[PDB]
Amino acid sequence: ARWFPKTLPCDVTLDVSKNHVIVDCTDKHLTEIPGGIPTNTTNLTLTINHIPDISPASFHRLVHLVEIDFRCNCVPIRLGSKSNMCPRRLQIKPRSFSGLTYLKSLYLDGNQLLEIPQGLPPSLQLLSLEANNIFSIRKEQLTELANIEILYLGQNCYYRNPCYVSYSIEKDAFLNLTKLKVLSLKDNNVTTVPTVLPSTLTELYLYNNMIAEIQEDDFNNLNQLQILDLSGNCPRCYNAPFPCTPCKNNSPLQIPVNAFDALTELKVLRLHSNSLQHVPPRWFKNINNLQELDLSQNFLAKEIGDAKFLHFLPNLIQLDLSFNFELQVYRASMNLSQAFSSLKSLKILRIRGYVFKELKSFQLSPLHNLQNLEVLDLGTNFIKIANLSMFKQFKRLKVIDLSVNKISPLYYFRYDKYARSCSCYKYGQTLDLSKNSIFFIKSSDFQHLSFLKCLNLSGNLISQTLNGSEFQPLAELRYLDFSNNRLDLLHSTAFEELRKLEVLDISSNSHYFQSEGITHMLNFTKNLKVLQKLMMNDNDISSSTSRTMESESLRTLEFRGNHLDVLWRDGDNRYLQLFKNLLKLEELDISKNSLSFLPSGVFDGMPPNLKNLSLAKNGLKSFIWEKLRYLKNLETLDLSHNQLTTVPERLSNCSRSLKNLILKNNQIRSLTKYFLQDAFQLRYLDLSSNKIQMIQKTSFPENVLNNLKMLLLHHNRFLCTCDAVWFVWWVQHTEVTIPYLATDVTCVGPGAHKGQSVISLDLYTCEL
Amino acid sequence: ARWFPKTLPCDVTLDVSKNHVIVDCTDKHLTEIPGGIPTNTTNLTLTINHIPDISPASFHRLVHLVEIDFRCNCVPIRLGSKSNMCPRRLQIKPRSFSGLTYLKSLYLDGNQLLEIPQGLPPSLQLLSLEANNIFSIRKEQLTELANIEILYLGQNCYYRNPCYVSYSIEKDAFLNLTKLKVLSLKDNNVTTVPTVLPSTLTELYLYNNMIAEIQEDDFNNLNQLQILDLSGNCPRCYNAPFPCTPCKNNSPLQIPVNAFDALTELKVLRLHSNSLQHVPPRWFKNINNLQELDLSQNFLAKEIGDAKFLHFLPNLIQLDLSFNFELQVYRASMNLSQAFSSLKSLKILRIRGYVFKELKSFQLSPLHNLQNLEVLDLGTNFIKIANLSMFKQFKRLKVIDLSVNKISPLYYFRYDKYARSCSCYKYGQTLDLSKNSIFFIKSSDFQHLSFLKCLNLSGNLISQTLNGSEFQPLAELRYLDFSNNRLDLLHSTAFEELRKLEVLDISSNSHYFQSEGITHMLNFTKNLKVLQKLMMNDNDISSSTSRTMESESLRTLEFRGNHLDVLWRDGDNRYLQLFKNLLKLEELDISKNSLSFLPSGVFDGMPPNLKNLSLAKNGLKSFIWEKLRYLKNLETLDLSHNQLTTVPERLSNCSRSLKNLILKNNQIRSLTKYFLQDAFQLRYLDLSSNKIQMIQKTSFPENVLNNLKMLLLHHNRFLCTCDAVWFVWWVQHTEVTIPYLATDVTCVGPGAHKGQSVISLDLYTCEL
């Protein structure tokens, strides 16, 4: 019961520990900075709005501002929306920030600014101007930035935001920025490394530019540099999903052998997409502490067989040599140099896109004595032959990725993977054979791999009847992903040999369930004694030879995308207890099952400890709410995206346990006279995207509403007459979390109030 | 134009040739028979309504009625809707039909009637009472039906509508119906064949009942019977998707060897699901003209190897022996008796569910000299081995169906396939290998099958790179369905060996298009010189090594369910001419491509003779209508299911050629002041399911409206104030076809008029 309503259209959060007062106006369709922002405000965000200008009046009384995030108010035409394009660039009038003597961070990204904003305070430490039209850096313009530490100037001249000229940087422009630790000139059409840079730099990003050559003294003084990224300079353009111009004559980024000599503190070096053909060992003579090295998207296929530079990298943790194939050569085998054995500290090795026919156990011998190896990733290689038992010498590894290959009996290709916008590994040893050509499996295929905890066979061609003899060696397996295959449940003994299996995914195995007259045994769960979660989604199951699935251990069953409307056809009582004998089942998802109505017997036939039930996306035109009494342990009920028109006359007389009721996206036009009356256990209600016009005090008593952790009411049809005087008042003074209060809890009428937010409504005329 | 607006909520059609005045009120949410039904009404339909009763007042002035279809006004609870269930059964008061001396057909199905309606006219020829609660037929109740010819009484006692007792029929109940040609007692829980039946019967349906035995004289006088159906009497219940009780001891329907002796005119005999183990030749001794014989769902696996009864069936056109497998036996081969060679007139032979491992050429030798054979269907048999070249001896056949099998290098199971409710074969010789386990193809697999005109490999495991050497023998192929496979377009020479190919379906081959960095050649079309239609739907295509698809012959390209939003990413002009060089393309479907906006260059890059363009289901939030000038041959533009808010200022200025414009399911709230001014080519406009409130005279000129073949306006937000005086008058007096005028062209306001149809609106108060 607030004494003064919050009318501001922004989320205000108070952080007493750090003396901070955060005001978040992200995406609030604002044409001006809202009035009445708290005076003690420290963090102000106005991202994704259409405020045309900033002036001294903008932050006149907000003298305690430490951060102003004013991003994407005039986002460039090719990056922003087309339905609501920006007419004119952001206008920053003089002395707009000079008064803010406490300002530490200022983001003015995506505003089509032509020049670096002047008159900034001396307390500024972070300045961000990405996605603007600033493509000429002059020493005089950066004079004001004396105490700056982080400076982002990238994305000011690239294919999604062209400047039509080369990027210009004056000589020694950043040299007097004596506190500059991070500098980013990425995606800018830069032709040379700007010099001289301040020696205090720790991170330098110059990727996706027109730098054809590095001079031997471009980084002669950066003795504190930790991260250096020179990627996408002379790019490898084969199959680039963005406009890509390589250097003439297919030449690489020319780097002198002594260019990195002063970088004794370098930890990360990224040379991705530089068309490199050789990696000279001399580069790493003085770089002893190098931890991460990205050499993906180059022409280093032959170099992988020699790789003498690896002898100078004993502290390297991550090595990426992906997509280095020779454009027209399908190699017979992978040639890994014996130098890979000198990478004592290596944890992650990725060599996707090498492209070779057969993997043999000996080819991986340089990796045998790398005690800290955790990930070996050989995905996207078109490997047709590989004895899976070879991985018995890699029991220590956490993940062995052979995804996207041909074995049988967006990351490397995106332009900027760090572009700013406005799983079973936890179980243990994982062998990923997903998206491969395995059509038949037998126990011998998994010999010597008893240690595996997860096996992902998702997306293979497995059209087979499993009888409990295909995975006999996998005695420790806890997770099997068998999705996107053609499983034939002819026998109820399928998967029984995997005695320690906790999670089984057989989703998207619809093939045999689509043809009539075929036997399906869904009672195979009885034999899996420690199974916790079974997913059998999108199988199109409309028939079953067995009438009951049984299990003493299963806690979650996902059965979405099936045809329970056909199994539970009215007049056919045979499958009404299909899930009843899953005695420890707590979560059942039967959404997307075309259940227009739930026959009588579905609720009585549910397992006894059912906590979360989803009936979403079913086209449910009716629901006997009284039947919820059978589900004595129900905590969450999800009836979203259906065609329900009414709520229960008394929710208390339906379920004593129900905590979370989700009714979003239905046709409810009114709540019953005493809906939540005496339903004190309810802690979450969603009635958003319905067609409710009125909500009275009897249907929504305050003794229940105040207990709610959250209440969603947005996108309804609220009629704002004097009869809604209670709803409008309570919404304005409630402490209960109602998301979208000031942006989507709107009046549809009458006349004057059409489109008006209920939070800003003044019904004083109703009381005179 | 019309002087008197049509206010009746039913479709009135006049057929001057056959002199009928048809009034169709199907599904019009009527609680009473509407007033003002024309006095000349001959055919009146009131199906799917909630009219609680019929009385003499119902058809008082409609003395010329020839047909009354009053079905499903109180449909049984298990068959009907649950959101709006029927409270009480239909009440027919006395003398309701006695006055209608011209009544020929009366349908009172699905009304929960307890007894046969009495007081019917002597002119009635067809009476239908299916899905009611009439399960006791007495001779006295049928005396009024003296001149009846067709009588449907089925579905009055089965699992979806139980009566809890056996069906009773009095002795000689139908005997005095001396004109009865069709009698149907299907799905009724009947225990014996009713006798004596009138000899004038031509069709008798007694399927899905509890008839355990036929007496030798049950059909002793039906010398004019043409169709006899005794299916589902002692049913085969293995994998029945409905409640199925077989006869005790697994015994069949007992039919004496001489039971069909009097049936010299029998053309169709259906013995589906009768658990038959033998078919005695003696049954067909006196049946010489039998044309159709259904023996599916029996236990005739061993009988198929002997089948001596086939020697008495030389005039049989259709033979069905599907789903006769021995429950626990997977046979090594199919044993077809040599007696099949005596079926001289056979055109269709279906033997699905026989279940056998190998198909050998000599096993089909009884079929070699059957000159009229057109269809051989061996689907759902789990055949693992079959030399496709064996079909060289079946060039005369139209369809060879081997769908749903394991070959590698609802119809038979529904309860009542005739239950009433309230393709490449045209190209020539078709070989259907769909839903099989073929993972690799080579030219030798199609040797000796050069005659094939269609080959359906849909839903196989083909993960391969085609280079133009896999289908070398198929020189006459006009249609290849390759959908639901894993095609790898590494080479642009894919499919080029099929030189006479006119239609190619490579839809749902998304596997290789989903992983990054893989080469895809979409320019393979250039080599196919007579290709007319290419479907490459739902492939998730977001990248392509080739920038242009070329073709001198392609007329239709379906590219829905792909990612043209990524290929045409703003700033990337490389794929804007992807479809430009398809010089003879007339229809392009680029719906479901996530195109929120169309970049500049898409319209200019379209082929020159593009006539039909679909951009439906894209989430298009904006559209530069002026760009339609580039599409000089445009005739149909489909922009349905998008987020467009405005129509062009003057459509005629955007496109001189456009004829059909579909804008259904958008956010259009108003039409521009001169929207259709001078749009002389427009013949079809769809503005339904939008949010339009007002339409003025200037937006809809009479010279353009009178040329429209159809105009859709339903499901809008029409405000019915005095400002809508033009639109309300125009809708009432126009002759233009506007569908759903009395069920969905409604007023949303103001107040009083909420929910009212605009056709029934009286705005006389606007002019005083």
Ligand SMILES: *[C@@H]1O[C@H](CO)[C@@H](O[C@@H]2O[C@H](CO)[C@@H](O[C@@H]3O[C@H](CO)[C@@H](O)[C@H](O)[C@@H]3O)[C@H](O)[C@H]2NC(C)=O)[C@H](O)[C@H]1NC(C)=O
């Ligand atoms: C087709 O006709 C048969 C009879 O020929 C109907 O079966 C009969 O159904 C009733 C009601 O379900 C059964 O009676 C009940 O039996 C139980 C168990 O003894 C008892 O607790 C009830 O109070 C009641 O007496 C009756 O036994 C049963 N008869 C036979 C021979 O099965 C059948 O329902 C009809 N089919 C349909 C679809 O209506």
Ligand SMILES: CCC[C@@H](CCO)Nc1nc(N)nc2c3ccccc3n(Cc3cc(CN[C@H]4CCOC4)ccc3OC)c12
């Ligand atoms: C219309 C399909 C009918 C079903 C019936 C199964 O209950 N068959 C099948 N239903 C499914 N879901 N899959 C398959 C299947 C997959 C591969 C090969 C043949 C296959 N059959 C054929 C079949 C097999 C057997 C196996 N026998 C061995 C078991 C241990 O010792 C003997 C017995 C009777 C059979 O049909 C009569 C079926």
Ligand SMILES: CCC[C@@H](CCO)Nc1nc(N)nc2c3ccccc3n(Cc3cc(CN[C@H]4CCOC4)ccc3OC)c12
């Ligand atoms: C990251 C994958 C990159 C692409 C590159 C294609 O330009 N490869 C592939 N792209 C697709 N879409 N599929 C396959 C593929 C399928 C099965 C086996 C290997 C496969 N490769 C591998 C490859 C093959 C060749 C075969 N050449 C013979 C053809 C006739 O004479 C020479 C040449 C270079 C190759 O990569 C270097 C690819």
Ligand SMILES: *[C@@H]1O[C@H](CO)[C@@H](O[C@@H]2O[C@H](CO)[C@@H](O)[C@H](O)[C@H]2NC(C)=O)[C@H](O)[C@H]1NC(C)=O
């Ligand atoms: C409010 O502004 C301050 C200053 O810009 C933000 O402080 C940064 O917080 C992160 C941790 O989240 C630290 O790693 C940085 O070093 C801090 N920067 C500075 C300059 O102190 C703070 O996160 C902002 N709070 C919100 C909620 O926006």
Ligand SMILES: *[C@@H]1O[C@H](CO)[C@@H](O[C@@H]2O[C@H](CO)[C@@H](O)[C@H](O)[C@H]2NC(C)=O)[C@H](O)[C@H]1NC(C)=O
């Ligand atoms: C990067 O700079 C180059 C020039 O160094 C820009 O290329 C020029 O673009 C104009 C306008 O299209 C042409 O008239 C010139 O001929 C181009 N010069 C050269 C040498 O190519 C290029 O547009 C810039 N990149 C971006 C994304 O703006």
Ligand SMILES: *[C@@H]1O[C@H](CO)[C@@H](O[C@@H]2O[C@H](CO)[C@@H](O)[C@H](O)[C@H]2NC(C)=O)[C@H](O)[C@H]1NC(C)=O
């Ligand atoms: C109007 O009623 C007549 C009589 O019930 C219908 O006539 C049937 O027409 C079909 C098709 O021409 C014939 O096969 C039937 O034999 C006719 N039945 C009788 C009893 O004559 C006619 O179809 C009805 N028209 C409509 C549109 O409902």
Ligand SMILES: *[C@@H]1O[C@H](CO)[C@@H](O)[C@H](O)[C@H]1NC(C)=O
């Ligand atoms: C491996 O590749 C190197 C060149 O990179 C070559 O010198 C060497 O002979 C190759 N060895 C094998 C076994 O392929």
Ligand SMILES: *[C@@H]1O[C@H](CO)[C@@H](O)[C@H](O)[C@H]1NC(C)=O
């Ligand atoms: C696979 O490798 C194991 C040894 O790791 C060996 O015992 C087995 O025979 C091999 N199988 C094949 C087919 O090479």
Ligand SMILES: *[C@@H]1O[C@H](CO)[C@@H](O)[C@H](O)[C@H]1NC(C)=O
């Ligand atoms: C298996 O791999 C697929 C991708 O091929 C991935 O979507 C899925 O999440 C993986 N399974 C698990 C359990 O991580």
Ligand SMILES: *[C@@H]1O[C@H](CO)[C@@H](O)[C@H](O)[C@H]1NC(C)=O
């Ligand atoms: C399972 O099938 C394999 C062959 O695929 C066979 O060796 C084994 O005996 C079968 N299991 C049982 C229990 O019959």
Ligand SMILES: *[C@@H]1O[C@H](CO)[C@@H](O)[C@H](O)[C@H]1NC(C)=O
């Ligand atoms: C599944 O049901 C079938 C009968 O329908 C039975 O033979 C089989 O033993 C059942 N499976 C289990 C694990 O109980």
Ligand SMILES: *[C@@H]1O[C@H](CO)[C@@H](O)[C@H](O)[C@H]1NC(C)=O
């Ligand atoms: C679903 O059940 C799990 C426990 O099995 C629980 O943690 C989770 O909160 C439930 N879902 C919801 C939405 O409450």
Ligand SMILES: *[C@@H]1O[C@H](CO)[C@@H](O)[C@H](O)[C@H]1NC(C)=O
């Ligand atoms: C609770 O609901 C049931 C069913 O709707 C009803 O019969 C009963 O009277 C209700 N309880 C009270 C106290 O009204």
Ligand SMILES: *[C@@H]1O[C@H](CO)[C@@H](O)[C@H](O)[C@H]1NC(C)=O
């Ligand atoms: C075919 O089946 C019949 C029985 O139906 C049997 O008499 C005959 O020997 C069988 N012949 C072959 C070749 O299998």
Ligand SMILES: *[C@@H]1O[C@H](CO)[C@@H](O)[C@H](O)[C@H]1NC(C)=O
């Ligand atoms: C398939 O049958 C043809 C004869 O029609 C024969 O020439 C060919 O060798 C057979 N192929 C196989 C694999 O047996």
Ligand SMILES: *[C@@H]1O[C@H](CO)[C@@H](O)[C@H](O)[C@H]1NC(C)=O
């Ligand atoms: C191929 O078979 C599938 C069913 O397996 C069917 O949907 C499709 O229409 C068939 N193709 C043609 C061209 O008829």
